[PDB]
């Protein structure tokens, strides 16, 4: 017999922030981004 | 965890002009590598 078991997590979180302001007039721009990639993997093989 | 966060400011006067900006880009990552492997055998022979 044998009992293979595998449990894999990959988590990624990536964030972007860009606030800007210009004046002489006034102008401003804010941008924000959040990204996530996730994978969960489970694999098993049992043989007798 | 990785961070790049920066704040810039500028005023200039002659009339006046100003600019101010803030950026903060960031990453976080995690991996978990859990695993197991059990194996075995039995012979038996009798006479």
């Amino acid at each position: 017999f044998y009992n293979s078991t595998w449990s894999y997590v990959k988590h990624t979180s990536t964030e972007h922030t860009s606030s800007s302001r210009k004046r002489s007039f006034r102008s401003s721009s804010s941008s924000s981004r959040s990204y996530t990639s996730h994978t969960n993997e489970i694999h098993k093989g049992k043989s007798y | 965890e990785a961070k790049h966060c920066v704040r810039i400011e500028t005023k200039k006067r002659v009339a006046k002009k100003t600019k101010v900006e803030h950026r903060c880009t960031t990453n976080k990552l995690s991996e978990k590598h859990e695993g197991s492997f059990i194996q075995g055998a039995e012979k038996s022979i009798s006479l």
Binding site: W6 | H33, F37
Partner: peptide, 29 residues
């Protein structure tokens, strides 16, 4: 290490027909 992640090659053909040859295999490292 979960060595099954680096799966085995199949057994090399038996080294000789008789009188105990050997067969062997590397992993896909």
């Amino acid at each position: 290490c979960f060595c099954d992640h680096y799966a085995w090659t199949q057994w090399t053909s038996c080294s000789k027909t008789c009188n105990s040859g050997t067969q062997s295999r590397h992993r896909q490292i």
